[PDB]
Amino acid sequence: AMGVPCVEDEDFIQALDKMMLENLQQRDTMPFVMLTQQFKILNVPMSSQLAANH
Amino acid sequence: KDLPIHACSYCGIHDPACVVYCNTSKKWFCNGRGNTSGSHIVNHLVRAKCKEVTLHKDGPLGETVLECYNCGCRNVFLLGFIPAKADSVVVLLCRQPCASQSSLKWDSSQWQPLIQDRCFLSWLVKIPSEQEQLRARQITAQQINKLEELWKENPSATLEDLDEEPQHVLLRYEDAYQYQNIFGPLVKLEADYDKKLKESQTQDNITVRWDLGLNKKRIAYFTLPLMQGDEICLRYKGDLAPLWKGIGHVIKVPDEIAIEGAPVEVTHNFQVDFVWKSTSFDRMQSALKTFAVDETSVSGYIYHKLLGHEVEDVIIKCQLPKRFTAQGLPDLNHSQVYAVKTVLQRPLSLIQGPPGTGKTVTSATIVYHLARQGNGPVLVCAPSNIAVDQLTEKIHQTGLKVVRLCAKSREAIDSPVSFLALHNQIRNMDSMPELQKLQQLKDETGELSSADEKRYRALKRTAERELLMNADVICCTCVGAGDPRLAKMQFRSILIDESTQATEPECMVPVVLGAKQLILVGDHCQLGPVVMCKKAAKAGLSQSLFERLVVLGIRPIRLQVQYRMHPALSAFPSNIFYEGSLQNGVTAADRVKKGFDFQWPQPDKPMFFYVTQGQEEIASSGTSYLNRTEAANVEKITTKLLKAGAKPDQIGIITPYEGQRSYLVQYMQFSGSLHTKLYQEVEIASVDAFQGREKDFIILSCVRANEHQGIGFLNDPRRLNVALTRARYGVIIVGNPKALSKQPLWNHLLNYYKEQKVLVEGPLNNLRESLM
Ligand SMILES: [Zn+2]
Ligand SMILES: [Zn+2]
Ligand SMILES: [Zn+2]
């Protein structure tokens, strides 16, 4: 489950982690509704922790 | 068409539910990982250092910029969902401050990043299925790295666009985009080469003659110091009639050429230019593009099989008939039945049809049963019009509705199946007497007034759609499959005869029209496609689809029973080229020609090698060889066969060299004992001219008497195979063993003929064995 994994996949993974960490500090399925005024419906899977718990 | 505006700028996936617009970069990216460790948008946002995205109109959320409900912040790296309590609503907030404990009231403790496991949340942006991603362009983390940098000041660039030599043809391909990048250039080399060649064939001071203008349109005949329907431009130079210019199509190939207002009083000073058309090359590129860009053009199975990927075997859910023999056609043999049976249950098959083994009837039988699965018309092709015409006729015998589609430039050409030609079927549609009326006017006049013409064209499209849409079978050349009239049409089942004689891009023109069941018929031990440009040929364009697949390890089904040769003649080629697998459908008794009192060196084996030890010489051309002694011996053998009873038009003389072919015709004209006409009907040519053709008796003239690399059947096993499998009743090889034996294939041949006691010497009357 790696594909054709490069030395620049490592860099991205590390780049992505840092990017989330960096941008904060300065400051079968289940239907859910999403806000937008307007509402829209998303199918959340049973896999997820939002479904798996609820 | 190209890909849509919203296609992933890395891999081209364009499902609206999967694509995310980067607002800074003004480009789209899918939410599939592909070959990378993270989704394609996330790959892009990290590298390009963007944070602001929008979803797609035709997607689920509609066209919404992703932003914090509370404060409007668009930074996807700060965004996540939180759910209400006991309630199935969910909002997008930035974690801090908007989604923080004190700031909130909603459940801050269940906040979930927009970006999960290096992708956008699947349940907001759909993740392309694996079959979709395996179909997309296979870009690697590193190529993205490079592509993303090539965009820092050339945003319009692609992976395809990242001099010297062209890339060599591969066996396996990452995807069809690589396939196009490899073949595309090669096709461009042949097109540019061909064009240059055609425009260099142009000739200056040609004497033209005419045919009476009683047939409305006029004919022009001339001989120059090359195919039917080829557009030729004739221009008159001089002052016997004002400077003239006219285009005509070739109707008679060769010396004499013949092409169907003009100055029919004058003879001398005409100029011949050969008009070049890009059509076939244009169509080939088109197919390569369609293959790369349109996921519907061929089935997932066929896509992956053609590119050399591992694909699990699939049984086609078709129904086998009760009797495999088609109506109108004679009973198939065990070998042919097994082929038909096997191929109907598979999405992709190769049939190998050795010389004499019944390809056409087998293919016609297969097409008949496909036709009756009822899933629209079967598409049947071949690289050449003669092969299509042969297959078209056999299919028609089964009583199916067949339409022969041909080039508009070849509509004046006749063939036994002209009556099946679309243009002729349209002319005979009594159901549309308006079209017939407007067609009457066209044929008694020059092209018609713009109102008349719009109407004519409209009804002609109607006629065309009527005939094609209702056809059980459509027959045309590979390249002819790219005709505009068949665009807009899906072909689930396709069969290509003689595919080993087309280049891949050629062969792929029909395949990219919806193939879900593809059958390639051919023989990779007989001649392959002609490729005029060395650079392209060396780069691998001479390899056919059939061949590549065979090398890949796909094992063709072989038609095993041959019906053409006397057993003695099949023996050697069978053993060397066909794994000793050919069975004889005709007995020795069955293959003694009637009215033929010829005394073979061994009576029951009708073949031999006559030793000639002539010196070769270079033909005053400067560019070939001839052997005068050998040619003498050939006429004498030709004369004996004629005296023995053989029909002249059933004698073929095959020779690798023009110089020999040319000398050989001259010699018999000026030095044979028999009447001059009799020899004149004996066909003399290269093996290329005898492909797919047969004679009662074949004489080979090898010409070379010194050590030599050789051209033609002297050094090509496939050409030797064809050379030895044209004759029904007998074959005689004339050459120098010492010269030929250097080649190990000929060594075997000579050792075999010797072992059969049929390598001989001395005068024909008193022929003896050769003690070499
Ligand atoms: Zn993508
Ligand atoms: Zn961007
Ligand atoms: Zn906010």
User: The tokens 């005898």 sit on which residue?
Assistant: B690
3-state secondary structure of B12: coil
Give ranges for CATH 6.10.140.1240 in chain B.
Answer: 417-470
Distance from the Cα of A30 to chain B's closest Cα (Å) equals 9
Name the residue among A7, A12, A20 with its Cβ closest to that of B38: A12
| Distance from Cα B89 to the centre of ligand 3, integer Å | 17
The CATH architecture to which A28-54 belongs is Irregular (4.10)
User: The tokens 């203008």 sit on which residue?
Assistant: B213
Task: Return d(Cα B659, Cα B666) in angstroms, integer.
Answer: 11
Output DSSP code: residue B692: T
Residues making up the annotated binding site of B for ATP are 336, 356-360, 526, 563, 694
**A16 touching chain B per CB within 8 A:** yes
- Cβ(B708)–Cβ(B739) under 8 Å? yes
Residues from chain A that touch B83, judged by Cβ atoms under 8 A, are 32, 50, 54
Q: For residue B761, how many other CB atoms are within 10 A of its CB?
A: 17
* CB spacing of A32 vs B145 below 8 angstroms: no
Name the residue among B38, B47, B97 with its Cβ closest to that of A27: B97
Work out the burial of residue B767: count CB atoms within 10 Å of its CB; fewer than 13 is exposed, 13-18 middle, 19 or more buried: middle
* CB spacing of A53 vs B110 below 8 angstroms: yes
Strand B119-120 relative to strand B115-116, pairing: antiparallel
* Helices (H), ranges, B10-51: 40-48
- Cβ(B500)–Cβ(B526) under 8 Å? yes
Tell me the fold of B563-772. Answer: Rossmann fold (3.40.50)
Task: Return d(Cα A12, Cα A15) in angstroms, integer.
Answer: 5
Task: Return d(Cα B51, Cα B49) in angstroms, integer.
Answer: 7
**A46 touching chain B per CB within 8 A:** no
Tokens matching residue B298? 């061929």
Distance from the Cα of A7 to chain B's closest Cα (Å) equals 8
Nearest CA to B141 out of B231, B36, B292, B232 is that of B36
Sequence-ordered strand ranges (E) for B169-292: 203-206, 208-211, 219-222, 231-236, 244-252, 257-259, 270-274
Task: Return d(Cα B119, Cα B53) in angstroms, integer.
Answer: 13
Q: Cα B122–B63–B88 angle (5° rounding)?
A: 50
Interface test with A, best of B11, B33, B35, B37 (most A CBs within 10 A): B37
CB-based contacts of B454, cutoff 8 Å, min separation 6: none
Name the residue among A7, A36, A45 with its Cβ closest to that of B123: A45
Tokens matching residue B413? 């050409």
Residues from chain B that touch A50, judged by Cβ atoms under 8 A, are 81, 83, 90, 110, 112
Tokens matching residue B182? 């490899």
**A37 touching chain B per CB within 8 A:** no
Distance from the Cα of A29 to chain B's closest Cα (Å) equals 10
Q: Cα B100–B105–B111 angle (5° rounding)?
A: 45
**Strand partners of residue B695:** B727
The CATH architecture to which B162-201+276-416+471-562 belongs is 3-Layer(aba) Sandwich (3.40)
Name the residue among B92, B95, B123 with its Cβ closest to that of A43: B123
Per residue in B617-633, is it b (16+ CB within 10 Å) or e — as a string?
eebeeeebbbbeebbbb
* CB spacing of A50 vs B113 below 8 angstroms: no
- Integer angstrom CA distances of residue B458 from B452, B454, B589, B633: 10, 6, 61, 64
Tokens matching residue B472? 């059980």
Give the ligand with the smallest distance to the CA of B97.
Answer: 3
Which residues of chain B have a Cβ shorter than 8 Å from any chain A Cβ?
Answer: 33-38, 42-43, 46-47, 51, 60-62, 64, 69, 75, 77-78, 81, 83, 88-92, 94-97, 110, 112-113, 115, 118, 122-124, 138, 140-142, 145
Strand B583-584 relative to strand B561-562, pairing: parallel
Closest residue in chain A to residue B43, using alpha carbons only: A12
Domain range A1-27, its CATH number among 3.40.50.720, 6.10.250.770, 3.40.50.300, 3.10.110.10: 6.10.250.770
| Distance from Cα B296 to the centre of ligand 1, integer Å | 18
* CB spacing of A3 vs B37 below 8 angstroms: yes
Residues from chain B that touch A43, judged by Cβ atoms under 8 A, are 123
Tell me the fold of B202-275. Answer: Elongation Factor Tu (Ef-tu); domain 3 (2.40.30)
State the helix-helix crossing angle for B385-396 and B359-371, rounded to 10 degrees.
60
* CB spacing of B36 vs A9 below 8 angstroms: yes
* CB spacing of A12 vs B36 below 8 angstroms: yes
* CB spacing of A5 vs B141 below 8 angstroms: yes
Closest residue in chain B to residue A15, using alpha carbons only: B46
The CATH architecture to which B417-470 belongs is Helix non-globular (6.10)
- Integer angstrom CA distances of residue B716 from B532, B712, B719, B738: 17, 6, 5, 18
- Integer angstrom CA distances of residue B724 from B64, B358, B527, B547, B565: 72, 18, 13, 21, 10
* CB spacing of A34 vs B92 below 8 angstroms: yes
Distance from the Cα of B475 to chain A's closest Cα (Å) equals 43
The whole-angstrom distance between residue B735's C-alpha and the CA centroid of its chain comes to: 35
Work out the burial of residue B486: count CB atoms within 10 Å of its CB; fewer than 13 is exposed, 13-18 middle, 19 or more buried: buried
Closest residue in chain B to residue A34, using alpha carbons only: B90
Task: Return d(Cα B731, Cα A49) in angstroms, integer.
Answer: 81
* Helices (H), ranges, B655-734: 658-671, 676-680, 717-723
* CB spacing of A32 vs B90 below 8 angstroms: yes
**A23 touching chain B per CB within 8 A:** yes
Task: Return d(Cα A30, Cα B666) in angstroms, integer.
Answer: 89
Q: For residue B700, how many other CB atoms are within 10 A of its CB?
A: 25
Cis amide leading into B510 (omega within 30): no
User: The tokens 């592509």 sit on which residue?
Assistant: B147
Task: Return d(Cα B761, Cα A10) in angstroms, integer.
Answer: 77
Give ranges for CATH 3.40.50.300 in chain B.
Answer: 162-201+276-416+471-562, 563-772
Per residue in B190-229, is it b (16+ CB within 10 Å) or e — as a string?
bbebbeeebeeeeeeebebeeeeeeeeebbbebeeeeebb
* CB spacing of B46 vs A12 below 8 angstroms: yes
Helix (H) or strand (E) holding B368: helix B359-371
Output DSSP code: residue B698: E
Give the HSE-up count for residue B114: Cα atoms under 13 Å, Cβ half-sphere. 24
Task: Return d(Cα B703, Cα B620) in angstroms, integer.
Answer: 15
For the four alpha carbons of B739, B745, B746 and B747, in that order, the dihedral sign comes to positive
| Distance from Cα B78 to the centre of ligand 1, integer Å | 23
| Distance from Cα B36 to the centre of ligand 1, integer Å | 10
Name the residue among B64, B97, B145 with its Cβ closest to that of A8: B145
Q: Which long-range contacts (CB under 8 A, 24 or more apart) does B761-770 make?
A: B761/B610, B761/B611, B764/B610, B764/B636, B764/B637, B764/B640, B767/B601, B767/B608, B767/B610, B769/B601, B770/B611, B770/B737
Q: How far apart are the first and last CA of chain A?
A: 30
* Technique behind the model: X-ray
* CB spacing of A23 vs B89 below 8 angstroms: no
| Distance from Cα B127 to the centre of ligand 2, integer Å | 19
Residues from chain B that touch A2, judged by Cβ atoms under 8 A, are 37
CB-based contacts of B122, cutoff 8 Å, min separation 6: A45, B31, B116
The whole-angstrom distance between residue B674's C-alpha and the CA centroid of its chain comes to: 44
CB-based contacts of B622, cutoff 8 Å, min separation 6: none
Nearest CA to B20 out of B120, B106, B137 is that of B120
Task: Return d(Cα B219, Cα B198) in angstroms, integer.
Answer: 22
The amino acid present at B261, given as its one-letter code, is: G
- Cβ(B520)–Cβ(B349) under 8 Å? yes
Distance from the Cα of B505 to chain A's closest Cα (Å) equals 28
- Integer angstrom CA distances of residue B561 from B114, B186, B334, B368, B587: 66, 38, 9, 21, 12
* CB spacing of B90 vs A33 below 8 angstroms: yes
